[PDB]
Ligand binder design. Structure first.
Ligand SMILES: CCCCCCCCCCCC(=O)OC[C@H](COP(=O)([O-])O)OC(=O)CCCCCCCCCCC
Ligand SMILES: CCCCCCCCCCCC(=O)OC[C@H](COP(=O)([O-])O)OC(=O)CCCCCCCCCCC
Ligand SMILES: [Zn+2]
Ligand SMILES: [Zn+2]
Lengths: 623, 623
């Protein structure tokens, strides 16, 4: 047992009867944290006779073999010559007395000849992380690495933001508590904490009350292959891998505090008040100037929404109790928990639809009962009731989706929109197969899909425009009277550019039902535009209220499409690849780009409903 | 390094400078499998200075400390004095040469005084399991234990049936492949295989083509606490646990072969032909003796069914790629995979509804077009179309549920049944709030819930009967003419016994919406019975066809309720508790008790629809 000292390299040879033993003695003072770390190298001509390293402490035995062997799932084998590990630090309890620690390193091998090794044992100068500072380091599949963070006294929540400038190697960031065994191995990290897979970015939101002693270990473990991440192997770090394989991942970790509760309250107030301003405005506009179908739709909506609410409640609970944060595809850099929600901002963000489709229901209902008055006293208002309920249910089902976004959790709100569309077109056509033509398309490529997939999209986007035009030709009360054609070719160019942008899987742009519904809405609004143009072709004066509504529709739809094209996350890929697109909060420290889309689409879709409703007021005199 | 021999106990004392070393030399012949195992005991006055045991082999280092420490999640601590482990066996390759193996056991401790220990090292006489024999053994949290199974050459699938006669300790049964990292620790078993939690029963279905070399390791790992199983701790094995804690789980494992493909084909044929016999019979019966609502319902059904199909497809894929078999609550003892299905029998079992509700649609449609003939040439057939579509969609959504049964995966088919019920009652009442009264109940206690929960059920079951009677009074074309009351009190006793049989642990046994729908159907059929009795109270002759149909309805509903009361699994509990109720296949080596319920309810529910349809033929002359 050599009285060995730190920071000094020891070379050695071990055979079947050598058993080299080093003894490292050190001390640790109350406040500081020591965190000894052990590096051992071998030379890899040991592969059938590895170098067996055993680190003995007062209460722990850490064994490993050097070369480090890894089994890749396609019957592949990797070995690492450099193996490094940090021993569980035990600090002297505050203001009580320093602790004298003694560590033993036994190096053995069962080889008919020698086995070469090199041993270094250091103390980590920067074990502990600071509350707002970036910290740079490297890790490897064989050299995992963890650090300690101590919560301050006036901080009750933090975000661990880990960033790497290169996608591979695929890594794991877990958050263990301070308890001796640290699980820092490929088969250990996913056991006893919260963890996130990571290619380029990761962000874990920790509360203070979830950690006894108000401190934790953040652990970085580099996987041997990139399959949970996508490319299934990647080594540029070391070109010759059997020679010296070092999947060296460079990391920077910053532990940022979180937003105070004042941000919560003032963003909540901002949203609710900026949408009740529509109420307080329409009230003044309307007062200063002085069915069976409906209940069918509500019965359908309630019993479509209930199982989805239960589903996402279960998903959220599972993600809470398990440390697996690869189930929900959040924007982990703007995701604020309130209770169990874990992303409350992009749920509150759907306040738009729920409030504004209901104000639209009030508007249509007032118009309708005033018409009933003027009729029994001496329009397809069911369609507008359907429109309002579809807005409110997009809001509801979108909040349910944004409880936990998955590859199984979407497809519910878009299916409800398809259902409401089909029901409206049945009730429209009865008063006046293309309906099923969309149903056969929205069900065939639901889960179907290069070139053979292209004709699938090119046929899909075309059949959607036809179903939208065949839908609108029935929904325009003056469809034939208005047109009684240069734009008809121009709209075909809009749809032909729409289809040609879909193509082989994507040309550039994913989710089949959602894409075809986007095409549906685009063609519907473009038909509305063509109808406005044909109204202006005649000398029919557009009243000031639909004037403001069409101006606002165009403006709001531009400002909403901008934020529709952000894509801060995607369930299309692995969780670690989704997680590398999300960025910070742009508005009020609380809302990301997708939340400004849930506001501006619920505002732009309400102004378009209003345009379509209150358009033909100039006919109230031309009966 | 003592030349030490097997099966002999060595006592010893180690201190800061002793480092006892034993050397065990043995040999291994080509065919046989050795599987050395190491037992080490300490005396537990070592708790701050454990006994550190290191087992060195030619290619592996197995370290542990003795006392074995365990952290229970509620800040609890357990220690185990006896620690036993089986070393990864490496067999001499067949017919090539025996292998001489050498094992080292280093026993150390850093104690100012002695540390007592005892060491035994044996060879496992029965490491390998046989293809049809039961094998009894014991395991403990500190003495995990695994065995090797080699597939025979004409067996391509097996079921590992593990049984224990006592619920706790909660255990894990995993199936690793033969590679010397064997993951047999609490933080290892769930990493690299298929695994099942287990209290009393577990059954894992392995294919031969999923194991290179056609053999595997089955690993039994006893958890330190029973939380993934329910009771959060349980030790009767050792009353004084800090003294000598031994959560000793007694296990018996049997590796049974599987059913051949002939069973698949003949059970599939049995089902399809026993249901096409209804076609081949009604054809002879009918030939030897010589709407907007509909498409609304189909549009609702398709777009309610699509997202659920996608959801359960995703669940099944997740369970396939992950080894976690605690996601789906199957009957693991009758669960036959075909492709990715993993339980094909209880999906094929839902062939009843899909075939028989569609034959009912054909019957109602023939009746309807013959009525159209006899009318334009010179009943609420929409309700019967709804009935047939509800049967077919119960079949479809039930198969989707039985792809992967969860606590998030039910609630979809029952919500569709509620939706169809509500739509039918709207369309019925319009031609002639209690509808919403059930909607408020079927939504309040959806996720609400002792005594305060009792009045919840007692009010729920009552409000369901009222909604069913208020539904039937509208659906009986001769509701008032027939009754123009002793059974009305007797039916109240049926409902009063129905509601006083809820209100119990939660509700005298699980799911609120499903229970209230069962009450709904019970009251509907009982109203049908009361109506038959009132028809017979008058001198109105019941034709022979409704005669056979009512006899068959009663018989089939008795024979179906018997199997409704089996409960082979339950998502109401943890997976390991579900798994302890499932039993073997009763019919044709392929169908369990729940599959004979999917046959006999789809047969009994069709005969009741037929009774209700063809009942009032004796009025075709009394118009
Ligand atoms: C038939 C009438 C009654 C039937 C009602 C059925 C449809 C009613 C409209 C409500 C549809 C709706 O809510 O849109 C939902 C999606 C939003 O999906 P997500 O990404 O926000 O989850 O919205 C979109 O995906 C829109 C994407 C692009 C739309 C904007 C393009 C229009 C811009 C100007 C035209 C060029
Ligand atoms: C208004 C007409 C249109 C309404 C549409 C719905 C009407 C019924 C059609 C479909 C009914 C149905 O599918 O029952 C589903 C459930 C089965 O659920 P599961 O356990 O099998 O997954 O079945 C049950 O849970 C039934 C439970 C037992 C009830 C039968 C007992 C009757 C015995 C005789 C009287 C005591
Ligand atoms: Zn969204
Ligand atoms: Zn079933």
């Amino acid at each position: 047992a050599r009285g060995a000292d730190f920071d000094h390299v020891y070379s050695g040879v071990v055979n079947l009867s050598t058993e080299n033993i080093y003894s490292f003695n050190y001390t640790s003072q109350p406040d500081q944290v020591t965190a000894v770390r052990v590096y051992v190298n071998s030379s890899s001509e040991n592969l059938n006779y590895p170098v067996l390293v055993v680190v003995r402490q007062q209460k722990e035995v850490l064994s490993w073999q050097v070369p480090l062997l890894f089994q890749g799932l396609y019957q592949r084998s990797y070995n690492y010559q450099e193996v490094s590990r940090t021993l569980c630090p035990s600090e002297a309890t505050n203001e009580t007395g320093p602790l004298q620690q003694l560590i033993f390193v036994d190096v053995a091998s069962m080889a008919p000849l020698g086995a070469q090794y090199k041993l270094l044992v250091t103390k980590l100068k920067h074990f502990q992380l600071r509350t707002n500072v970036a910290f740079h380091f490297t890790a490897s599949p064989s050299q995992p690495q963890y650090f300690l963070y101590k919560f301050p006294k006036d901080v009750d929540s933090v975000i661990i933001k880990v960033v790497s400038e290169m996608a591979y190697p695929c890594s794991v960031v877990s958050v263990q508590n301070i308890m001796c065994p640290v699980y820092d191995l490929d088969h250990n990290v996913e056991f006893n904490g919260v963890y996130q897979s990571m290619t380029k970015k990761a962000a874990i939101t920790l509360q203070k009350k979830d950690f006894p002693g108000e401190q934790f270990f953040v652990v970085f473990v580099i996987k041997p292959e990139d399959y949970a991440c996508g490319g299934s192997f990647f080594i540029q770090e070391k070109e010759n891998q059997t020679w010296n394989l070092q999947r060296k991942k460079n990391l920077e970790v910053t532990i940022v505090p979180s937003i105070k509760e004042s941000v919560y309250v003032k963003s909540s107030l901002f949203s609710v008040f900026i949408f009740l301003s529509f109420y307080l405005g329409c009230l003044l506009v309307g007062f200063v100037h002085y069915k069976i179908y409906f209940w069918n739709i509500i019965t359908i909506a309630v019993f479509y929404a209930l199982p989805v609410i239960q589903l996402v409640i279960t998903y959220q609970t599972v993600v809470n109790v398990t440390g697996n944060q690869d189930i929900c595809y959040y924007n982990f850099l703007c995701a604020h928990p309130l209770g169990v929600l874990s992303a409350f901002n992009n749920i509150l963000s759907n306040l738009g639809h729920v409030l504004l489709g209901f104000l639209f229901l009030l508007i249509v209902l007032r118009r309708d009962i005033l018409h009933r008055r003027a009729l029994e006293a001496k329009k397809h208002f069911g369609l507008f009731y359907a429109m309002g309920i579809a807005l409110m249910m997009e809001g509801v089902l979108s909040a349910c989706y944004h409880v936990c976004p998955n590859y199984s959790n979407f497809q519910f709100d878009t299916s409800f929109m398809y259902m409401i569309a089909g029901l409206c077109m049945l009730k429209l056509y009865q008063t006046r197969a293309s309906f099923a033509v969309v149903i056969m398309v929205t069900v065939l490529g639901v889960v179907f899909g290069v070139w053979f997939w292209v004709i699938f999209s090119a046929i899909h986007v075309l059949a959607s425009l036809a179903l939208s035009t065949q839908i609108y030709y029935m929904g325009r009360f003056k469809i034939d009277l208005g047109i009684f054609m240069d734009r008809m070719v121009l709209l075909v160019v809009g749809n032909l550019v729409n289809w040609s942008f879909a193509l082989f899987g994507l040309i550039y742009r994913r989710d089949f039902a959602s894409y075809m519904l986007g095409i549906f809405i685009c063609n519907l609004l473009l038909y509305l535009a063509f109808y406005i143009i044909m109204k202006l072709r005649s000398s029919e004066k557009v009243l000031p209220v639909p004037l403001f509504c069409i101006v606002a529709t165009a403006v709001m739809w531009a400002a909403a499409l901008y934020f529709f094209f952000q894509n801060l996350s995607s369930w299309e890929g692995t969780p670690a690849e989704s997680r590398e697109k999300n960025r910070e909060c742009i508005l009020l420290d609380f809302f990301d780009d997708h939340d400004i889309w849930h506001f501006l689409s619920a505002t732009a879709l309400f102004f378009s409903f209003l345009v379509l409703l209150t358009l033909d007021d100039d006919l109230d005199v031309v009966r």
